[PDB]
Design a protein around this ligand. Structure first.
Ligand SMILES: [Ca+2]
Ligand SMILES: [Ca+2]
Lengths: 318, 313
């Protein structure tokens, strides 16, 4: 014969504060448990993003003044406009998009990871201001803000993701949260890399690479959480979501092409920046578990640009 | 413009959160970190970002010797107290501070509250970091079970949440100041009591880093409260003052009951309550009101205040 004979039961008996509110102020609230992490990926991502904390003071942007002064007023205007347009997209993501992901989290740890994302995107936006403080006149700064509000091709991109963040479909909101860091700013990042490949504004591109180090993780993590939810849904629902991802991406690509053509119209950069953008559209799809349909020609990046994009972002410490 | 007004684009546009709130209307502007509408926002952004820290920077393993001199009952008290603080930080990080973003007066304030939320998440994560070093798995789990099942704790956790979710921004803002400004001090008394007695010095370094953030969060929410309230009619200002005092006294009652239960076997409650009420006075002052509390209601022993400002046991 033989003798006939559950840890952390409290967790199933309780709710996170967000869930308490979602349930109409009902339930026993649990503290986050950082000692028993439901998904190890959350702890990995928390560690990465917090260890990657930076502020723009880390970069000696004043060392870009010599090369900045070799640029014509038209190039300086292009840079200020491009960067103010990127600041707009970061403002959206920091104050609306990443915040909106907090209540749609699968785990308590993910809820606070998205507060880090929102804050770090605010740092991205603040970094462009630091660049402007160093390089630009007050007139250049103000004219770029005026141009941002009045440029419809830019506004249409800024408008495009906001309904998904405010409406009640958490999966579509998550797709938007991956598309912002994974795709929509790359046509603008083309510009500093084009310049730094030609010896102009090298320190600014170090800021861009610190921004990218964060954006890559934001895209990866939102895509990871998208897949975690979608994998449990019916085959019909999974196919519906794939169709939505491709539909929204293609719509964003069309808006991006129209904007970059206008933005770069005097400079000849739009065709190259569009290929750089579409290369990143393919990476975005891969981070959500899909195959890229784009051809080599549609995604071609010249070696000197790819070097700037790919270089590692690494005594001042935080 | 007749007067050559600068930055007219600002009046012709909306922030992204306002574009959402107005039914998707308006031209959206980027934040302008070169033109800061209220210079206090730049001061606060600079201080909170310069004050970034993470708990792993503090070698809590060096507290093991002194942790071991504490009885199982004292260790349980610490784990429970800190897990209760972790709950309040979880509320503020995931609900309270993020709820302040759409009620901001300036674009810069919107993102300052994202920093607040993230840093409060770091505060909550810090207690877990301490537990990883000092506590057994059983101590950690039992404290979580105690948190969900202790009604006096839950009533405080439940008190402020409706203001963050409902649609009165000033009442939400009062709560956002009350959380860092009042509700956790009854708990913070314990590590300082222990550190005044030479216990857990590295843990008290973490507590001081948390406090350095909380003081600013309380100050800033109170500053923004006063900015909006000063524009209200005298009768609406009076209604708001009555709300502040009523909610505070309610939370004081919930807190006194909680601290009496928490510290009952240790004889710390009366001192911890005076420590809590001292900061209640500082909360009222940060909202522009006079503290009605007496010196005896707010008495902090000099050993405790030194920890704040850095035979019986
Ligand atoms: Ca070209
Ligand atoms: Ca006593």
């Amino acid at each position: 014969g033989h003798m006939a004979s559950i840890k952390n039961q409290y967790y199933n008996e309780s709710v996170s504060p967000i869930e308490y509110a979602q349930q109409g102020f009902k339930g026993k609230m649990r503290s986050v448990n950082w000692n028993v992490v439901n998904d190890e990926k959350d702890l990995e991502v928390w560690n990465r993003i917090t260890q990657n904390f930076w502020l723009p003071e880390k970069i000696p942007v004043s060392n870009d003044l010599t090369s900045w002064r070799t640029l014509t007023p038209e190039w300086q205007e292009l840079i200020t406009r491009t960067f103010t347009g990127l600041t707009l997209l970061d403002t959206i993501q920091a104050t609306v998009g990443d915040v909106a992901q907090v209540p749609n989290s699968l785990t308590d740890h993910e809820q606070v990871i998205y507060t880090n994302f929102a804050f770090m995107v605010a740092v991205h936006a603040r970094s462009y201001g630091s660049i402007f403080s160093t390089l630009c006149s007050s007139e250049q700064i103000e004219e770029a803000h005026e141009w941002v509000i009045n440029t419809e091709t830019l506004q249409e991109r800024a408008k495009a993701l906001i309904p998904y963040y405010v409406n009640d479909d958490p999966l579509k909101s998550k797709v938007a949260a991956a598309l912002m860091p994974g795709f929509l700013l790359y046509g603008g990042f083309y510009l500093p890399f084009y310049l730094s490949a030609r010896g102009k504004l090298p320190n600014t591109s170090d800021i861009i690479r610190l921004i990218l180090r964060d954006k890559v993780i934001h895209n990866y993590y939102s895509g990871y959480k998208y897949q975690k939810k979608v994998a449990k849904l019916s085959p019909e629902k999974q196919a519906e979501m794939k169709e939505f991802v491709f539909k929204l991406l293609y719509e964003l690509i069309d808006l991006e092409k129209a904007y970059l053509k206008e933005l770069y119209e005097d400079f000849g950069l739009a065709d190259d920046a569009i290929r750089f953008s579409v290369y990143n559209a393919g990476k975005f799809l891969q981070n959500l578990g899909y195959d890229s349909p784009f051809t080599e020609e549609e995604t071609r990046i010249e070696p000197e640009i790819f070097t700037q994009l790919s270089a590692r972002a690494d005594d001042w410490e935080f």
